Design a protein around this ligand. Sequence first.
Ligand SMILES: CCN(Cc1ccoc1)C(=O)Cn1nnc2ccccc21
Ligand SMILES: CCN(Cc1ccoc1)C(=O)Cn1nnc2ccccc21
Lengths: 305, 305
Amino acid sequence: SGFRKMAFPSGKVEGCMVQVTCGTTTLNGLWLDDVVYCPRHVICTSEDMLNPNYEDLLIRKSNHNFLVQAGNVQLRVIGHSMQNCVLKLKVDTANPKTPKYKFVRIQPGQTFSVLACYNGSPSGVYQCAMRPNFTIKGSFLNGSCGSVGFNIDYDCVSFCYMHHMELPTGVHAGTDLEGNFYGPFVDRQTAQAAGTDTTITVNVLAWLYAAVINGDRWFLNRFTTTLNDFNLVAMKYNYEPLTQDHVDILGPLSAQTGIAVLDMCASLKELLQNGMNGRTILGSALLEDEFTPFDVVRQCSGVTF
Amino acid sequence: SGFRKMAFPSGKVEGCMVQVTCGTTTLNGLWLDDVVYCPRHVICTSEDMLNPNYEDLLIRKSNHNFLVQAGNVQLRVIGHSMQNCVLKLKVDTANPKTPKYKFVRIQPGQTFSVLACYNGSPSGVYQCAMRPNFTIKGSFLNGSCGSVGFNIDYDCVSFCYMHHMELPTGVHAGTDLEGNFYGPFVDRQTAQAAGTDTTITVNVLAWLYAAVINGDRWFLNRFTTTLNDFNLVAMKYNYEPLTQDHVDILGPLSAQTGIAVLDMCASLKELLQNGMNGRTILGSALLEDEFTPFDVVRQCSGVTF
Ligand SMILES: CCN(Cc1ccoc1)C(=O)Cn1nnc2ccccc21
Ligand SMILES: CCN(Cc1ccoc1)C(=O)Cn1nnc2ccccc21
């Protein structure tokens, strides 16, 4: 028992991290097969960053301008291409450490692990969620660009995120591995509206189930509710609307605990309306929304990779 | 910017995990050089667990009774020895994936990363602290025994924890890698008092510094205090006493922020006496004590391994 904000083991991804240098700029790249993926703003200078013309900047670059280093060994760049906001550098050696992998574009509310890297070397790993407004609340310093987010399913790494930018608000923005930003964001050093964020309701409910499984019981009440009544409350507290698809994905946790989903919604309603009276749930004094129902089932069933 | 509960990258440790089977019992082992380390209770049966006579149980075992498997490959056991509460199985092959490593016995209040494993396969990684009462608040299911805790300093893994037991209270207990339990605990399936726990004061202060560095400012006040006055408050709220050694290790964070340690103590005093009035600090509505001052400096300075 016990419940922790658990990340995926990072070894499969550590073996794919490289350093990419273009001019004075160094950031991280992802080496899979014979391609290295990195943010295209590696080709910018400080004069460039308010509104870089990436096409013009890249035209001035040749294969030999991209310095790619994996630990101590230098990789030979034999082609380069810009896809959306990422650069793809073809190298003459396939990464011997390439795992089975997929590129996926995740949905808001889904979670993933981030391997924070600097100069191609991993620094740490942590779990987070893609916010409903397509930002992430990460821990990134300058030089972390090109760090990636991922999930693992048995032997397959699904890469879903590459880090590009810290907004002036201190939240983080990035792309899928085809270089498409999540959210409205562009790779320019400008103020950029993220728009209203909300709490991921289905994840809060999953975490309340995790709490019950692990012995925090005190918030269970004598009440039930309806999906309409609950969603009127959700709207008032800037929670995402709950759908039947969400109720369905919570089914396994309902079955394990014997607590119907709408009964758990009624417990959440009371917590929203009354707060926690200085109590805690799973070591938290707020309602946690960074565990999906599938995260709770894995951590509670001990799935390995 | 941003601040996360970050674990060390786990790849170096993943390559050391094996499965150890003795009879019907399977748990995890740690393969370093030509020795596999695992909890000695792998040799118990359910009849045994209220008070196992480990010496008598081990005398009935031979090298060929210990089944050790690294992924798909079987290891050949050529010796066995019990050291305190761990078994050391000498194997005929050195682990080709052995990192540079040390065994360390950590102090209460220090933090480390746990690689939770089942059947020798890693499941997830998370950061935690050794409580002042020598328990840990982990996430462990049956079969996780033998999972290890560790820190990394450049290329060297310092192993500090091996998981043995879940107490009836749902908290966790284990040993250093010489098999000595942290705390008063014994490897028997019994109720065992953990004794009074306390909050790790120097870590809470480090985290308040991390908050200031990252822009949470609201709890800073016009006040200061003394070490005596503060420690009278610490005692009332079951916080560890603060010493000058703690003030000294907080020096770098004081210097970075310009906030004297005793001024930050006065902010913490007011939070303890008044609560947070429904506010949050770094995404938390409680005072977080699982970051050491050295954790905060790394995460804020971007150290890699
Ligand atoms: C310098 C590049 N830009 C802006 C940019 C320019 C073009 O496209 C995006 C970043 O925001 C890089 N970045 N990413 N995470 C960070 C965390 C702390 C400090 C900087 C950080
Ligand atoms: C079965 C062995 N014992 C008791 C024991 C017997 C001898 O020495 C210790 C454990 O508590 C194993 N254990 N460790 N973490 C757990 C988490 C959930 C369930 C069981 C768990």
